[PDB]
Amino acid sequence: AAAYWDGDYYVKDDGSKAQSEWIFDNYYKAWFYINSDGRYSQNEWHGNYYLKSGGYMAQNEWIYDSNYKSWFYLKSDGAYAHQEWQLIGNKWYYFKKWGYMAKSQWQGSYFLNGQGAMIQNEWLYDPAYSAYFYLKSDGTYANQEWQKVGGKWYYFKKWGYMARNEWQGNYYLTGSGAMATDEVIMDGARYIFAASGELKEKKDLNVGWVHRDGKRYFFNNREEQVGTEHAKKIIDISEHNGRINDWKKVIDENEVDGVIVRLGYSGKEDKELAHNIKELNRLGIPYGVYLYTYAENETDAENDAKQTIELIKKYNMNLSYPIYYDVQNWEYVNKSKRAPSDTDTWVKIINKYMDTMKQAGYQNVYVYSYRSLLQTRLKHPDILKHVNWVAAYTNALEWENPYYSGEKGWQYTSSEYMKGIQGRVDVSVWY
Ligand SMILES: C[N+](C)(C)CCO
Ligand SMILES: C[N+](C)(C)CCO
Ligand SMILES: C[N+](C)(C)CCO
Ligand SMILES: C[N+](C)(C)CCO
Ligand SMILES: C[N+](C)(C)CCO
Numbered sequence: 141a142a143a144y145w146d147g148d149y150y151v152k153d154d155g156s157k158a159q160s161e162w163i164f165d166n167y168y169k170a171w172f173y174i175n176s177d178g179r180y181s182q183n184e185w186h187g188n189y190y191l192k193s194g195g196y197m198a199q200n201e202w203i204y205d206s207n208y209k210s211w212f213y214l215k216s217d218g219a220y221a222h223q224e225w226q227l228i229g230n231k232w233y234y235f236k237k238w239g240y241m242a243k244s245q246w247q248g249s250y251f252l253n254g255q256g257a258m259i260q261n262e263w264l265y266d267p268a269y270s271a272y273f274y275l276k277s278d279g280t281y282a283n284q285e286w287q288k289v290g291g292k293w294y295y296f297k298k299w300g301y302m303a304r305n306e307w308q309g310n311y312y313l314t315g316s317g318a319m320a321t322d323e324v325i326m327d328g329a330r331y332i333f334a335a336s337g338e339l340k341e342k343k344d345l346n347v348g349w350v351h352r353d354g355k356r357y358f359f360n361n362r363e364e365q366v367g368t369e370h371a372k373k374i375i376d377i378s379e380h381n382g383r384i385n386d387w388k389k390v391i392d393e394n395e396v397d398g399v400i401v402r403l404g405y406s407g408k409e410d411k412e413l414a415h416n417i418k419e420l421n422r423l424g425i426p427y428g429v430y431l432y433t434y435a436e437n438e439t440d441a442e443n444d445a446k447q448t449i450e451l452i453k454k455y456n457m458n459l460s461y462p463i464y465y466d467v468q469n470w471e472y473v474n475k476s477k478r479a480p481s482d483t484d485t486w487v488k489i490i491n492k493y494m495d496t497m498k499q500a501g502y503q504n505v506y507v508y509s510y511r512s513l514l515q516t517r518l519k520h521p522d523i524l525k526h527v528n529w530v531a532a533y534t535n536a537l538e539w540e541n542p543y544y545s546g547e548k549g550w551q552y553t554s555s556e557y558m559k560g561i562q563g564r565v566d567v568s569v570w571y
């Protein structure tokens with residue numbers, strides 16, 4: 141009867157065109173903003189309000205704005221939510237200054253996931269703080285308190301840091317954070333815990349590298365001698381240990397018989413390789429080397445072998461210990477690729493590496509891996525025949541390999557501290 145749309149323009153009750161003003165259209169039951177040129181706004185903002193395609197003011201709804209690359213939420217009056225929480229579709233969301241939805245980030249004691257929702261009853265590893273946090277049922281981080289999560293007990297310190305490798309009263313939180321319910325061997329002692337977690341007893345032990353009756357032996361955490369008086373202490377080092385300031389100190393003070401040096405991984409040289417080889421050669425310290433593989437197939441394996449050979453000659457390496465193909469359940473950082481799961485593919489990968497190295501004149505070449513992989517994915521006679529260095533950070537290795545006989549190593553720890561090295565060190569007993 142009265143006001144009406146004329147293309148981009150709006151003719152009001154008085155017969156004049158709208159200009160620089162909001163109008164409410166009863167037919168559409170929506171608000172529209174008319175600009176100074178008399179045309180309605182659309183697919184754009186006006187102050188605190190967003191005008192959708194066709195001009196309709198957004199209200200009680202999400203809008204994704206591709207210019208800002210952000211979600212926004214327009215409230216009951218159309219105004220964007222900002223510096224405030226909103227319960228939407230039965231989930232809590234936080235809006236920052238200027239209305240940008242919070243995502244993958246903290247808001248005080250709450251954490252918003254990648255879709256903006258406040259998380260509840262979830263673990264969060266936050267690399268920004270380098271620790272685990274647990275967001276409770278109410279969304280707040282567990283703090284100075286116990287929480288039972290998935291059948292196990294965890295303790296959270298001040299500021300919510302998950303306790304690990306440490307005591308909280310009568311309870312010990314293990315490396316996973318889980319409360320000990322069994323036994324823990326540490327500090328040269330065995331700690332015995334009730335099923336409910338409380339410490340019951342501590343029994344002194346004399347395990348590890350021990351000098352007894354004029355000779356040196358290695359005892360596992362079951363107090364069993366591993367090897368003979370000639371058992372050797374071998375560390376393995378990489379750029380991850382940083383630059384070693386004084387190698388001679390490391391060797392003498394820790395009684396280290398030899399070193400396995402990381403070459404790098406498929407396609408990349410280790411940052412400390414050059415320095416490590418230089419020093420180990422200069423001091424006549426016995427060493428071997430290892431390459432962490434990201435191989436998927438035989439081509440990758442032959443390339444791994446070529447890289448290995450290239451580095452050996454480049455640095456004039458004098459190899460007292462073997463060349464090691466370090467085989468693990470690898471996965472790219474960006475998760476774009478992961479190791480082949482089938483045994484037969486690894487049989488081909490491993491044997492191509494071996495054959496290539498052998499053809500190049502290197503006969504002292506073996507596989508390193510961890511016990512569980514060797515019991516599963518790598519359990520094949522043509523793989524196991526090459527395996528003589530095995531990782532298991534356990535009380536005993538208790539693993540048999542009928543396919544290899546001779547000198548071998550057990551990497552029993554990745555958490556040893558040694559004089560002259562910053563941080564934790566991998567150590568093996570060679571027997
Ligand atoms: C709602 N407008 C009339 C402004 C345009 C869509 O027909
Ligand atoms: C306040 N506006 C007129 C801009 C619309 C919502 O009420
Ligand atoms: C919603 N923003 C504040 C990001 C733009 C509109 O003024
Ligand atoms: C629209 N969001 C993705 C921001 C939340 C609702 O799924
Ligand atoms: C609105 N808060 C997120 C702050 C509390 C609701 O869990």
Ligand SMILES: C[N+](C)(C)CCO
Pocket residue numbers: 246248249250269273281299300
């Ligand atoms: C969990 N912290 C308290 C450490 C940071 C976020 O508030």
Ligand SMILES: C[N+](C)(C)CCO
Pocket residue numbers: 263272302315316317318
């Ligand atoms: C804290 N979690 C149990 C989730 C991780 C242990 O590594």
Ligand SMILES: C[N+](C)(C)CCO
Pocket residue numbers: 406407434471472473474
């Ligand atoms: C991206 N990564 C370094 C994990 C893969 C190496 O090929």
